[PDB]
Amino acid sequence: MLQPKRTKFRKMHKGRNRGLAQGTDVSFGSFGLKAVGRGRLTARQIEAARRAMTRAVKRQGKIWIRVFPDKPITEKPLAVRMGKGKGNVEYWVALIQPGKVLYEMDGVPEELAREAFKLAAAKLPIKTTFVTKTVM
Amino acid sequence: ALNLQDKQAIVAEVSEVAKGALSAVVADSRGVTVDKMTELRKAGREAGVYMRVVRNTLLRRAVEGTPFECLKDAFVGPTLIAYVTEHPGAAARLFKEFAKANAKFEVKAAAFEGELIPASQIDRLATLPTYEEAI
Amino acid sequence: MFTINAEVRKEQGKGASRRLRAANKFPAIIYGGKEAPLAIELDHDKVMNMQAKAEFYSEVLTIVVDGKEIKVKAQDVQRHPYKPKLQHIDFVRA
Amino acid sequence: MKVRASVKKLCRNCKIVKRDGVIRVICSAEPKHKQRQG
Amino acid sequence: YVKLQVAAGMANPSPPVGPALGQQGVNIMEFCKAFNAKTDSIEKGLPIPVVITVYADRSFTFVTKTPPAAVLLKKAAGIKSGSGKPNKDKVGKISRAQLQEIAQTKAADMTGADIEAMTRSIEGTARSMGLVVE
């Protein structure tokens, strides 16, 4: 599970998730999984989708993970009233905007990359699409 | 399937063989296993006869180049052509005993002389001796 | 060889450019050389098919505007964030 | 009969049919492949 | 109608031949010594394939063929067993000449129009069994 090794602060504001994404094109590999929806990606979802793609291509070629869950999310335990300070950090998320490229793959045929990305997309809470590297 | 460049090349080659040969025998060969074909191929190579199954459309194109344009009508149904390029006949001969013996397929029309040859009367070619008989 | 038909834009801005993309077109610009830059409109899907070929970004294209051919090269392309669409193209005079 | 929300062709012989507004999968080969959306 | 690969001047055994065509209606001893009778001329220890041909009255005829390519290639490489992992583990060498010999035998049994073609097929086998042609 991806997680920052250390942070300047432990807890962060909720914030908002407006706007479109940066890094909207395949920059390392040849095929990419681009998010068309908006939402959060927990570190477990990222790891689950990575394993689904890693096993799909039988550990072949190269795989990049363009996102990183750097935002901590706190929760209050059960049977606890409101107040008495912010909750404890439970997991980390990466904010996703439409157009964000999540994963990139290289070294495999396209027809195999589509199935690998299709298996991984089933683990993610946001709608995605298949993209390929283009001549800028 | 077969790109247009393919089929053009298939025609060209069948046509070039048609120029060199001297006796063409055409037959149906549907409903015969590949072993009996493989056997007929060793009998063709042995007897110096060139054997091809080719699309009836595609043969009509080869033929027209000369002098087999009588054979057009022989290209309705499954077609097997027999080009005796070295010596004449022997194919006409070979096909009939092979035809009779195997009671599958038929044999259509042959062609020598730039004249179509009728199914029954092919017995002419199928009895012409050796070259190599005039001595 | 790619030839493109274009029309000169009547007005610029965010409001005008979004109306173009709603009308199955998209703006572009032609600069380079000593001439003044020229703002043009392009038919989207027709240009979208041409840019799908790798030589579109390497060879020299001709844009006929007011019946006048201009030889240019594709400089930069602004694509839609998540749709197979174009938003803007920079053309530099060859 | 498999009653699920996502019906799909499981082999070459599976056919998609819509009967009375219900998407169904009928297979002339594998009776296990018989599905209906529900 | 059954096909076997039997050792030259050897026949009869139960796990080898017996049961196999024995459970089809075939007279064992007859085929045994007829087979051996005609396969006497074969070199010692050449495994030869025979196609046995039985008719409704349990009587039979058979054809003898040339030994398998794998066999001749085993003998030509002087080995006993093909590679367990052909083309990952190499287990020997036949010259182009040995290929050609085997090809002419198997030519009596091939479908190649030329020496070269037959040889190429034999090479195909030789590759298939991790023997290099050297």
Add this chain to the structure above:
RNA sequence: AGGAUGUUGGCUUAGAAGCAGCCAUCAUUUAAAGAAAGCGUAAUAGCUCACUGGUCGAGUCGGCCUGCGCGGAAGAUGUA
């Protein structure tokens, strides 16, 4: 209608013959026919696919962008 030859490819195994598994996947005759896509056998056999010739005779194929619909959709007094 054909779907062949080396050949039951090599290894393994009691057997492993396209079809438990491992490795290889060449070559021939080909119109075409994978050292086999699925069923089948103790292993063969046997069925079928890929592929190709024939018949038919003008369209047929599968991706994208979008509009509107379908399923997914089970609660308690009574349609609600």
